[PDB]
Amino acid sequence: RITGPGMLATGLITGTPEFRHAAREELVCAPRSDQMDRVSGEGKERCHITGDDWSVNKHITGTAGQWASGRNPSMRGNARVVETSAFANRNVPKPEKPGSKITGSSGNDTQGSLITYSGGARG
Amino acid sequence: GIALGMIETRGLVPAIEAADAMTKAAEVRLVGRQFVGGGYVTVLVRGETGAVNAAVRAGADACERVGDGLVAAHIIARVHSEVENILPKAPQ
């Protein structure tokens, strides 16, 4: 009925006037492969040190566990991560490889790594 | 104008198109363009509330299908005085 810049981006905009919801919301050390430790050096628990070690059983209580996490209130949220990085883009879709049809002694290795000259042509 | 309208995008090309449509589409001044790191680029404008609503809507619609695309398009009609400390004043 009324046209103008208001009609655009109906779902995308999040703002103050109408979007705001109303009245609603064997071995001494355990196998390296089959073991992973909380602390990763010096405090590693893989190796069964026997004696008066600094390890703590379930009977003792304090300094770790609920006695550390519970102190400070916290909340968590499901925000969306794409992880744009060189590692993440290591499987990015790519166009068909350039093909070399040069017929001269060009040192043209078509079995090695892709060396693209200007325009994306292989060489 | 004290209203704030921010549009966030993955990459710069969608942001510059969003800024172009945002400014062409109403009275708004491009106060800042911030690289958030990780790809995210935020372009934010200032103006009167009605103008910012039109500018933000134009930007979100324009840049929705440019490059990686739109992440956020948000409006704050009056940002608290504290928040002004973390907002750019003139474009850079």
Next chain:
Amino acid sequence: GIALGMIETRGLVPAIEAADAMTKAAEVRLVGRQFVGGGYVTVLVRGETGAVNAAVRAGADACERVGDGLVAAHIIARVHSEVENILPKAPQ
């Protein structure tokens, strides 16, 4: 204020909305906004324990659906004196 309120987000638009909601909701001071990197933006506030608790709840709800969204909303009633050195004093 001793209490520290923290809200992390994926992008700057949710961070600004969170900071605006935090400051509006209660008596908090926006000590700093930090660009952690790789798309993370963290907003820090300091105030009395009661205010920070109210502000952080307002911030988490405000930015929950804005942009990529909220990562963490954390409250620390009293930081150890050592931690004070790694916290921003004033925003920039």
Next chain:
Amino acid sequence: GIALGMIETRGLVPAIEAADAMTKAAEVRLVGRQFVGGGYVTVLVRGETGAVNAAVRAGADACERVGDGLVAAHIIARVHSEVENILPKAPQ
């Protein structure tokens, strides 16, 4: 010299190849190169509307097959005055 041609690539090698193809194809100036972060790189060129339509197409084709590739190819025929602030004038 008002049309803006922007090519965004994942990495810098495709960005440089796109820049070389764009400047070779048409009579366009390479205003700037920007590291958007997160692996994005954007190359912007300025020229006549026809020259920037040819350069962008030439650049997009060239950098498609180089490394991670092209994320976006965009043309802004008329660029608003405000946007000029966030547009680099010359390449650093």
Next chain:
Amino acid sequence: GIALGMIETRGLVPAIEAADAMTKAAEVRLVGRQFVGGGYVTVLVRGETGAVNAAVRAGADACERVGDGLVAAHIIARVHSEVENILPKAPQ
């Protein structure tokens, strides 16, 4: 003490919660907070070998479920003099 204990986390909020937990848990002194990049924050403490181990385990538990979580937790009882050059001394 000279033993070094480090906790790595995704985002600054779990990093600060860790540093708060380690400092409060045992007799350790916070010495740095590094922004590794990519949304990774490392908090390093120094103290007696026993104290550092107790602090780091407490910190790991504390930041394990805050925000994007915990990446690593490490203690080096004795650090070679060479590695002292790539370690922060006092938090800035």
Next chain:
Amino acid sequence: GIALGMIETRGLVPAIEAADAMTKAAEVRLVGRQFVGGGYVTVLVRGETGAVNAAVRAGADACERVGDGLVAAHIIARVHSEVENILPKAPQ
């Protein structure tokens, strides 16, 4: 030497290996290392077309299996004058 040879890798280790292999293979100048962001590290050389054709190929073969890998290996025998502004002239 006016030709340009660029190699982009995921990380600094393959980049340094690529840089070493290229400079050791032919008579080329290592003129820049560029942390593009998000891990991408571009190392680019300037030399004769034959020297840079043989340097880039050796570098690519050397850094392909090192670390995360090799993103792109590119050669531009003739570089447009405009693109010369966005190319390093000496190591950062």
Next chain:
Amino acid sequence: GIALGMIETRGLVPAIEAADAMTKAAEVRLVGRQFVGGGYVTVLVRGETGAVNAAVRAGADACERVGDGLVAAHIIARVHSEVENILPKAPQ
């Protein structure tokens, strides 16, 4: 010595563990710790070929399980004179 040993890791905690293991294992000199970006952290050691080879092997095993793990572990017996410009001379 001129032999160069480079170890790349995801995060800093593995890098510090790697550097500690390397400097402890053999007579190598830690010359730099580079934050590549994207999370990668690269520690470079210079020494005699025998010492660097021993140092890198010890480092690769020590940091493999720490944090997000190891990305690369490389040895270059002789580094070209050109590359040494892009190699840090001493840690910072």
Next chain:
Amino acid sequence: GIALGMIETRGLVPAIEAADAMTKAAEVRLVGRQFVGGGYVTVLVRGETGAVNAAVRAGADACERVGDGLVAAHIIARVHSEVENILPKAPQ
């Protein structure tokens, strides 16, 4: 105020009613009335984006049931300089 609000109608009576409704409803100056030909009469008003939005809505609601009716209601927040020389500059 640089926003333009236009309300076409069939016949003059709905146009005069729309012109009266729009000006009374909000702060908009009536730039003109053009007899488009074929029984279409367009009334154009200028003002702030928010004012024009209120005026145009009021005008459309007033002329909907007056005579033949409403053809178009449109709001242009920003008018390009070119379009100026085709609009009625003089209010009378």
Next chain:
Amino acid sequence: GIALGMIETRGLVPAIEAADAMTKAAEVRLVGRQFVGGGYVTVLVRGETGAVNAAVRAGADACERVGDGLVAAHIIARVHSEVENILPKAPQ
């Protein structure tokens, strides 16, 4: 600001809530709070048309369930010049 927005409530506690929400939502001036008598209290604000709209929506939503409730939430884009005399300019 020409535009006027009035919220009427049963009691004063809802009126104060509406006034706080309105002034926080957008850029408006609380020009008066009137005790109509018989339980009604009317808080009315002045501002731009766009800001006033955003303000009254927030005020209506905020005070809807506080105390007895909300009686009326009215928006006038521009009052007649005559009605300006019976409107407060600053609160008593």
Next chain:
Amino acid sequence: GIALGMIETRGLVPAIEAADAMTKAAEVRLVGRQFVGGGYVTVLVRGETGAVNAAVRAGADACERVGDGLVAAHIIARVHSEVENILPKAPQ
């Protein structure tokens, strides 16, 4: 303190009881008593957010069954400076 806690009742007897229970329970100063009219009485306290939250709760429980009863019990942790104009500074 700046947090505002308002309790509204039908009649003065519950309002005075609310003031007594509120002021006794926590550390909040009684800033105003307002006769809205129609039988409504409003008692206003100002204090720290934690202090105000305990006081409003105590007052509400206390006046809930005294006379006609409790119309409302509201807390505003931070009142906009505009609303400060319409609030009593001290009691009558």
Next chain:
Amino acid sequence: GIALGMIETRGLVPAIEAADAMTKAAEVRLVGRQFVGGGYVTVLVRGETGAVNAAVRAGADACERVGDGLVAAHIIARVHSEVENILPKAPQ
């Protein structure tokens, strides 16, 4: 310019929206706006062929649903020198 772009619409509200979209999109000079009679309003823009193509496409898209509608959108790269006589040189 030589390229001629024409858009015909039913009424002046669909024509003004096109004219605004045309000149905004590309650097096209608006030469004429003709009331053909019978409720047809034609807008002619003159510019470069590349600029006119973008202008007409933008103009046609913007006013397809604005008012009674778009009749047609026609681009002529170069008109015969004879047809220049029946074209409007400047807007009325």
